[PDB]
Every structure is written in C-alpha cells, then in structure tokens.
Design a protein around this ligand. Structure first.
Ligand code: CA
Ligand code: CA
Length: 80
C-alpha cells in the first residue's frame, strides 16, 4: 500500500471498534510500525518485550494529548 493510506493502515490495523482511537490492545499490532525505532515504515521486529515498552512509549509519549490512545494526527506525527 501507499504511505498516505498506510497511515490509515496503522489506524485500521487493529481498530475494529471504530472509536477513532487505538488502545494498547489495538496498538499491539500497529505500533510495531508506528513507533519507528530502528526503521521508518519497516517493523523493527527486534524483541517483542522491548517492543511492548515501545508500544508503552507510544501510549505514554507518542500520545501527545495524554489520552493514552493514538489518533491519526498522533501516529501521523509518530510514523513521520
Ligand atoms: Ca479502536
Ligand atoms: Ca492520543
């Protein structure tokens, strides 16, 4: 897919609730891409547990609004 829609890909990746937000439960699949650590769009499958903290790092830091979820504008900033 193309990067632009791939942003919505990170959104729909685990958003089966349509609340326009992603909790860690959702983000467990998505943040593997969104939280670019040792890569850009590529999933840095380095260590699942470290990746868990990476996911936390999203809900704790990449979440700029302190809501604990990642919105389109949030992950857009995070993946770019
Ligand atoms: Ca959701
Ligand atoms: Ca948020």
């Amino acid at each position: 897919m193309s990067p632009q829609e791939l942003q919505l890909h990170y959104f729909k990746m685990h958003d089966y609730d349509g609340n326009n937000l992603l909790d860690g439960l959702e983000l467990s699949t998505a943040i593997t891409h969104v939280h670019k650590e040792e890569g850009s769009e590529q999933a840095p499958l380095m260590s699942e547990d470290e990746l868990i903290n990476i996911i936390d790092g999203v809900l704790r830091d990449d979440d700029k609004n302190n809501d604990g979820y990642i919105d389109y504008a949030e992950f857009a900033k995070s993946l770019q």
